[PDB]
Unconditional design. Structure first.
Length: 214
């Protein structure tokens, strides 16, 4: 179950790029859903197979035509206090709703993508893991934003997003909402990671965070 994060790229200069959420890899092609994969700035090796954006109101990273927008440094093996501090720093001009709980929801939701402890993917997509790999990322991402940014998506709230969801995504969202608190997260066996965006003039970039097995 879940989607492994077995990437091992480490950048020689400590800087990383992301392929983005829905972005073109090459400007003459149709955009693809890229799971916010994070790559080394030097070798373009994945460092983390997926990641999640932590600030829906900031700039999103991309790597179209191999030109980075949004450059990151990595904080390894984060805990509740570090996550909370870094998340808050990335939201200087917005308040995070139920901030106390922000680590709990992020760490649970990202783990549900990594491991899927309650078998949401089997129930929503069956054996179609290729579709689920991106379509489940997207619903997990929106639910992360419910908690980072108050972006609750439903048939009567943020309808412009909801109506774009596939039927399987809609089912998965209901399962996520039912199952969120109904498992224990095995923190001692996991490495959570934070990607801190380098400063730029103006509205900055969203931070990213992700998880892998140790």
């Amino acid at each position: 179950g879940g989607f492994p994060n077995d990437a091992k790229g480490i950048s020689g200069n400590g800087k990383y790029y992301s392929l983005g959420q829905i972005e073109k890899l090459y400007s003459n092609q149709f955009a693809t859903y890229n799971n916010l994969t994070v790559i080394t700035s030097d070798t373009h090796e994945n460092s983390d197979n997926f990641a999640f954006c932590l600030a829906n109101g900031k700039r999103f990273p991309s790597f179209t035509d191999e030109k980075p927008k949004g450059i990151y440094t990595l904080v390894k093996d984060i805990n509740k206090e570090q996550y909370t501090k870094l998340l808050k720093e990335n939201h200087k001009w917005s308040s995070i709703p139920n901030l106390n709980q922000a680590w709990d929801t992020f760490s649970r939701l990202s783990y549900m993508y990594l491991k899927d402890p309650t078998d949401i993917v089997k129930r929503a997509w069956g054996t179609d893991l290729n579709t689920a790999r991106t379509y489940f990322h997207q619903v997990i991402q929106y639910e992360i934003w419910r908690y980072t940014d108050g972006m609750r998506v439903s048939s009567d709230t943020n309808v412009y997003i909801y109506e774009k969801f596939s039927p399987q995504q809609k089912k998965a969202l209901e399962m996520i909402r039912t199952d969120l608190y109904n498992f224990t997260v095995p923190y001692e066996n996991l490495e959570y990671r934070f990607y801190k965006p380098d400063w730029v003039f103006g509205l900055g970039f969203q931070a990213l965070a992700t998880v892998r097995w140790k």
